[model samples]
Target chain A: SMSLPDGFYIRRMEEGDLEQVTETLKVLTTVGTITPESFCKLIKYWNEATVWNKIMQYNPMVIVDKRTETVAATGNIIIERKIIHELGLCGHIEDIAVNSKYQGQGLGKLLIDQLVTIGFDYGCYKIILDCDEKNVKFYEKCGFSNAGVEMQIR
Target chain B: LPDGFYIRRMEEGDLEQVTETLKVLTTVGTITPESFCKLIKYWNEATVWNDKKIMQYNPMVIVDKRTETVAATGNIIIERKIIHELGLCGHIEDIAVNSKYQGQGLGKLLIDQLVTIGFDYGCYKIILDCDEKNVKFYEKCGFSNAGVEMQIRK
Candidate 1:
């Protein structure tokens, strides 16, 4: 509404953005959260020399609304090196959420699209994610499809 | 012949042979020894990246006990996430058998071994992706497709 609402921008997350990202992620509790300190440790683990850029890193990026200086939404991609693909890089997206008050504003679409682009930027042969059957159409609108079955053991 | 093979942890000497084994699955690019080492190191580092210490890559190999060569290989990538009640998740990847050694039940052996490792790491569930043709194969190994796996490519 109103020409994209001024001062909204997207960028990669940093240690300083922890509290806000943690706040933003509250919209998805089943996805859960951690203390800011643990979040910091997770970020460091992802950015460590051994981990960073290898699996494409655990990149949690956010949409910042400078008008209120808050994280409006958060999404990320974990690049994987697949053993059987011509192009081994694959991206797995996770933790995508928009602030409850900000839902229906299309911020979620923006976040997903950006993450897909970032996945390609990292040379991913493909990017994928999972969701409920009801939400399948939603991700389909985001350019995903129901291609194969996902199974698990507990 | 049935007792000529054994499963065990991969060693440094297995790298080149393992890389060659993986090539049968895909020939787009060669996996260099250095990159492979980096991957294994990254795998080991992540297993203890958290306080609960929840991740690892155990590359299990099926060796021809007599020839003393790697005849097949598979691995499990263990990691933690905040979904589905939150605990350890295991992703099984790179299960391969030498073209010369095909149809000897090595695939089943390797998949079974990795599934065991998945449990050892406290994984709440273990998952993997494969083509439609391989569905029956995995099913024979005690895996069943639960839903469709979807993705978008560049």
Candidate 2:
């Protein structure tokens, strides 16, 4: 993990990251994925442009491909606490999408590591994300262990 | 910003107004103000919101430009994961402005603000997927369709 490809650079998101994030999401959600409108409405509560910078102060991170000068991956962490006083349960992963063509290059793993590091920096207790029980194996590859029935709001 | 009229959460007292917004998003014949109460009741347990009393989400209601009657409404709900697995990652489950308020751009404004809220809580991803035909609406509002679904029509 020390030396990535020569042309690839992992960095945080700026204004330019929006389009790439949106595009990657489109690709990832293909084949029975929810349409973006409904998707956006469902997710807008936690990804607004105005408040994102605040997150970067703690859990924001993104990946860039220096070779193509494009964002190869994007995501951030959600700490369980407001700060140190409160204990957090997990670090949620947000806006994570790898360029469809760039899949299987370990770049996704790279982006996740950055998020984990940020979570530690934020003083969070654990880092976590949600997925189907089937995909739990995928996240487990990144070191995620399931809580075995975390109650959902539903 | 208008004189004599203001905006605030739609409360139990505003059940009629809340129902008006629901009508815009759902079939009018299939729902009523009591349906709104049922929705609030279900949202109480189903979403990530903290309040157990189906009363916290007063989904904002806009009063008429001249009267006390409710003219518009928009509210949101969050899935339960953030309570333990993550911090406060929630989605904007529902949003609707009355027909008279539709073209005025209230829907877009409310949605945009909701995204801001999502980021404020350090949510990882704010996601919503809507009907395919809503492509233009969501696209214009800064969402890209994911096109994925685990369709089950049983």
Candidate 3:
């Protein structure tokens, strides 16, 4: 099991972590800007769609530096229920990021491991993610294999 | 919508044919008749209270009215995001067309319908991952190269 340093610990993200979480995620992509009110609204939607619904599962986690009260790393997994494979579930992992100042501490693997555990616990047959070429080796080290190409319309 | 063929939301009775159609894409494992009914019920319950704030699981099928068999199938999962002011993102999943029904515009029709459904649900963007061979097909449907997909299968 990978362990965090003395000052860092991971937990489910809360409304209070919005600022730090968004800032931390900018390392992955453009996060734009958001207000606390907007953040809470989306959090409510996520909870309503997954937590309140009995069948689906969504987990957004963050690692925090207790001493500074700042977020160090974060990621999320959404376990989708499907009709294939006798009602199989698939996990979608997204927005995995670690603060630049906190790199080389094995936080990324720790976050991926936690998400993987949640995916299996919720009965996911497979867990998948779309990532950049530069990050392929990082995910590979975290146990993922190259699968396919991602396409999008923005 | 073509003559003698129509697209519509997937119904409980459609599970059997839906699974069969999905096999054209990949392995479906084993889903018995009784399990099919149960799975449909579970999916139905999840969408019973659909609204803007709720995550949606939408499965669509194109049926050949003459033969009463599913010709093509696809689904979109609208995932609510906290970024971009509660933006909703659509994930297009499990697109398949029966081999006998391929090359007849069914695949494009299915994708078009799913894309419409995503926008109707207020998704800011839609994304999908497909085999390298299918990149051109999706590009023709208005998608562009975004990234690579990675997986860890259990």
Please tell me what DockQ candidate 2 reaches: 0.03
Task: Report the Cα lDDT for residue B16, model 1.
Answer: 71
Each model's lDDT: 0.72, 0.50, 0.81
Chain B TM-score of every predicted model: 0.84, 0.65, 0.91
- Tell me the tens digit of each residue's lDDT in model 1 across B1-154: 2599888877656777787788776563565666666666655565535545555668788989887889998888776554433356787877778899988788988888888878876777798767676788888888866555668989
Candidate 2 residue B27 Cα shift, in angstroms, is: 45
lDDT of 2 at A86: 20
Ranking by lDDT: 3, 1, 2
Candidate 2: Cα lDDT at A83? 11
Q: List candidate 2 segments past 4 Å from native.
A: A1-6, A30-58, A82-90, A150-154, B1-154
Per-model TM-score, in order, reads: 0.77, 0.42, 0.90
Task: Give the winner by DockQ.
Answer: 3
Candidate 2 structure quality by residue, lDDT tens digits, B27-96: 3333345645554453343333332332222256667766577766655433322122223444454456
lDDT of 3 by residue, B36-80 (tens): 666556555564122344436788899999989999999888776
TM-scores of chain A in all candidate models? 0.83, 0.67, 0.88
DockQ of 3: 0.63
TM-score of 1: 0.77
Q: Candidate 3 deviates by what RMSD? A: 2.8
